[model samples]
Target: DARSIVEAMYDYVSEMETDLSFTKGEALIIVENNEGDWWLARKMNSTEVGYIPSNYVKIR
Candidate 1:
């Protein structure tokens, strides 16, 4: 199963948000086979790799 948002954040990023302050945090998710300028993964057929805004992922 995919790692829960709560677990991922604590291990990686402590706080999460879409504000300017959160934007400053260099948080990123890894894509199996990223091909875009930004980190992208094409390993999953259901969810193609793309540069998703980091703010979308929350700590809670």
Candidate 2:
């Protein structure tokens, strides 16, 4: 069960429209992680879910 939340540590720009983009200080809910370099997540203020760099967020 991956119900953990993480906060963006810096502004992140997605390389594709299917990816998620957010500024620093944004909060995101962890959707799933396969123990890879990226994690699927959704912004707390929106339903737009996509992949984000695993290194750009900090577990909270």
Candidate 3:
């Protein structure tokens, strides 16, 4: 279940973007929960509903 997944804090994050200059101090972290469903939450404010990866988000 989503609640059973272990959550960890990410202190540093490197932008995968080509520029690499645009770093988000507070970005959303997404992980596949134990149920196998992806979940996303804001690193700064996790209480807010997070976004999901759409079919358009391709890793380059």
> Lowest lDDT 10-mer window, candidate 3?
17-26
lDDT of 1 by residue, 1-60 (tens): 562221123222223331112233234334432233323322223442334433234434
Q: Candidate 3, residues 1-60: lDDT per residue as tens digits?
A: 432222233232334331111132334433433233334433333443443322212222
Rank candidates by TM-score, best first.
2, 1, 3
* Cα lDDT tens digits for candidate 2, 1-60: 448789999999878987899999889998888679888999887889999999999988
Q: TM-score for model 1?
A: 0.24
Off-target runs (Cα >4 Å) in candidate 3 are 1-26, 31-39, 54-60
Q: Residue 39 in candidate 2 has what lDDT?
A: 89
Highest TM-score against the true fold, candidate: 2
In candidate 3, residue 12 scores what lDDT? 29
What's every prediction's RMSD, in angstroms?
10.5, 1.7, 10.2
For each candidate in turn, the TM-score is 0.24, 0.85, 0.23
Candidate 2: where are CA atoms >4 Å away? none
